[PDB]
Amino acid sequence: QTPDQAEAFVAKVFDVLDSYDYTRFGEVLSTDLKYEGGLQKTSGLDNFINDIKASTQRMPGLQTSHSRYRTELTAEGTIYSEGHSNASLESNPGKVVTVPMIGVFKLDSEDGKIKEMRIYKDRLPFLALH
């Protein structure tokens, strides 16, 4: 239950997400994950997984990375991790779109996985890839 422990966890979480190893999502994400990314909402890990699978077809050769810069853990056990979201196409690497982003995470009592994940970034700039 420390702010540095939280950032460390967030890093690992994005490492699995950015790797697109869909089988390892269950590891760090709850089965009933309430995800919210702008006007995208998903209940359950299964629907979340299919929504990212959808995104890999929409932009094939999509490469994404996240970098933390400021994390904070609250009394309620809510992680607020400000960072940066990066995206690029295998076709044209070294054209990278980068936007500030914040993750709001709430953990599950028993397993220590993420039951609530809300990601706020401006998605407009990533249009330079489509």
Among all chains, which residue has been given the structure tokens 């540095």? 4
Site string for its own copies, 29-68 (x = CB under 8 A): -------xxxx-----------------------------
3-state secondary structure of 9: helix
| Alpha carbons 87 and 62: distance in angstroms, whole number | 7
Nearer to its own copies by Cβ, of 45 and 79: the residue is 79
Q: Are 64 and 86 in contact (CB under 8 A)?
A: yes
Element housing 61 (H / E): none
Nearer to its own copies by Cβ, of 26 and 52: the residue is 52
Q: Is 104 in the site for its own copies (CB under 8 A)?
A: yes
Residues that bind its own copies in the complex, under the rule CB under 8 A: 36-39, 72, 74, 76, 78, 80, 82, 99-102, 104, 118, 120-125, 127
